[PDB]
From a paper:
Similar to the core A1 and A2 sequences, it also contains an acidic residue in the middle and several hydrophobic residues at its C-terminal part. To further understand the molecular basis of how [name] recognizes [name], we determined the crystal structures of the [name]–[name]/[name]-A1, [name]–[name]/[name]-A2, and [name]–[name]/[name]-A4 complexes to 1.90 Å, 2.00 Å, and 1.70 Å resolutions, respectively. Despite possessing apparently different sequences, [name]-A1, -A2, and -A4 adopt remarkably similar conformations when bound to [name]–[name], both in anti-parallel manners with respect to the armadillo repeats of [name]. At all three interfaces between [name]–[name] and [name]-A1/A2/A4, four highly conserved asparagine residues, N507/N550/N594/N641 from the H3 helices of armadillo repeats 2/3/4/5 of [name]–[name] function as rivets fastening [name]-A1/A2/A4 onto its surface groove. In addition, two basic residues, [name]-K516 and -R549, straddle the middle portion of [name]-A1/A2/A4 peptides on both sides. They form salt bridges with a conserved acidic residue A1-D330/A2-D503/A4-E370 and make hydrogen bonds with the main chain carbonyl groups of A1-C328/A1-G329/A2-S501/A2-G502/A4-G368. Furthermore, a number of hydrophobic residues F458, M503, and F510 from [name] cluster together and form hydrophobic contacts with non-polar residues such as I332/A333 from [name]-A1, L505/T506 from [name]-A2, and M372/A373 from [name]-A4. Accordingly, point mutations of T326R/T326A, D330K/D330A, and I332D in [name]-A1 eliminated its binding with [name]–[name]; the S499A, D503K/D503A, and L505D mutations in [name]-A2 undermined its complex formation with [name]–[name]; and the E370K point mutation or deletion of residues 370–373 in [name]-A4 eliminated its interaction with [name]–[name].
Adenomatous polyposis coli ([name]) is an important human tumor suppressor protein which plays critical roles in diverse cellular processes such as Wnt/β-catenin signaling, cell adhesion, cell migration, mitosis and chromosomal instability, and so on. The N-terminal armadillo repeat ([name]) domain of [name] is the most conserved region among its vertebrate and invertebrate homologs, and mediates its association with a variety of binding partners including [name] membrane recruitment 1 ([name], also named as [name] for ‘Wilms tumor gene on the X chromosome’), Asef, Sam68, and IQGAP1.
Numbering used by the authors:
A (entry chain A): 403 to 741
B (entry chain B): 365 to 375
The structure:
């Protein structure tokens, strides 16, 4: 893998020229007139393109990992982001896409690489900033990296992902993306992030229009005939539902979109993931709210939940039974008065 | 739960 080593050296050298330049040219401070490096003049995009293509293969990934390929690619992505900012320049967008694709491939299934990339704080900030790119393809690539980093995140990674503002940035991104594949990556990352801590759940719920959008995903209609968006949107909803349950304003947003009625339809889904997410959401929404308790009674929820308590899937079993016992502990007056 | 998983890059 001598050519690969050569390509990594090409990009490390280019980064070195960039860092030296950044160090020696602080705006407002005395400095020479030597020009800022441009990646187009050093064949950078072709190099990262070749690396991105090789990174699909586990054998080339092994050879990259021995050579420190992840750090070299991350450093290039970071430095181009710092030098040029949010640009629509095709060359810059293309190099950042290819760098991100490689980072996605190099983090997949790879505990050590995820840890390394999260430790690159400057790179993590650069990644989060790219979610505002006008290139939806770049947004998809960045969300893919964040999805992988957020999966099985260690304590340090969880903290870094939170501190760089990935949650708010991804939720805001979700509200505007057009393609299903971008949305899949963005919601998958959010499904992972929303399980990490209470603060991430709050941050999602705080974004203007986020809850309505998540409720909307429960009835998303895939043009590719998959259930990935309903599963991920519903998975985020389940994870933040513990907070929704104690916020009347947020419950009202759900009501305006007939959320409870949709979750009951989800109990009859042929997808266990969809059923599980619905059971988890109902577990929370069925607690400590007379209005939504009565609504669930009225919509026949008791029988639907009772149907699931023998399931044998931990979360369907747990959630269905917890929702059922909430409803049974809170039989509405109009049922009690009617005997 | 973290149901989001992980995935390779889209070609």
């Amino acid at each position: 893998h001598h050519h690969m080593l050569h390509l990594l050296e090409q990009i490390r050298a280019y980064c070195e020229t960039c860092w030296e330049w950044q160090e020696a040219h602080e705006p407002g401070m005395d400095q020479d007139k030597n020009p800022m490096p441009a990646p187009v003049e050093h064949q950078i995009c072709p190099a990262v393109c070749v690396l991105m293509k090789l990174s699909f293969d586990e054998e080339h990934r092994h050879a990259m990992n021995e050579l420190g390929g992840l750090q070299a690619i991350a450093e290039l992505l970071q430095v181009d982001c710092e030098m040029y900012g949010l640009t629509n320049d095709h060359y810059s967008i293309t190099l950042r896409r290819y760098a991100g694709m490689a980072l996605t491939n190099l983090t997949f299934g790879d505990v050590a690489n995820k840890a390394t990339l999260c430790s690159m704080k400057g790179c993590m900030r650069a990644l989060v900033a790219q979610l505002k790119s006008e290139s939806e393809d770049l947004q998809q690539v960045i969300a893919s990296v964040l999805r992988n980093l957020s999966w099985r995140a260690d304590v340090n990674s969880k903290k870094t992902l939170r501190e760089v503002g990935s949650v708010k940035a991804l939720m805001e991104c979700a509200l505007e993306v057009k393609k299903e594949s971008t949305l899949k990556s963005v919601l998958s990352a959010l499904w992972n992030l929303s399980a990490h801590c209470t603060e991430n759940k709050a941050d999602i719920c705080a974004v203007d229009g986020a809850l309505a959008f998540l409720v909307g995903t429960l009835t998303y209609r895939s043009q590719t005939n998959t259930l990935a968006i309903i599963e991920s949107g519903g998975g985020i909803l389940r994870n933040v539902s513990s907070l929704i349950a104690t916020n009347e304003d947020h419950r009202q947003i759900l009501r305006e979109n007939n959320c409870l009625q949709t979750l009951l339809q989800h109990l009859k889904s042929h997808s266990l993931t969809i059923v599980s997410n619905a059971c988890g959401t109902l577990w929370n929404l069925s607690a400590r709210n007379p209005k939504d308790q009565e609504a669930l009674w009225d919509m026949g929820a008791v029988s639907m939940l009772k149907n699931l308590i023998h399931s044998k899937h931990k979360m369907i079993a747990m959630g269905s039974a917890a929702a059922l016992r909430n409803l049974m502990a809170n039989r509405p007056a109009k049922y009690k008065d009617a005997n | 739960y973290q149901g989001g998983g992980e995935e390779m890059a889209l070609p």
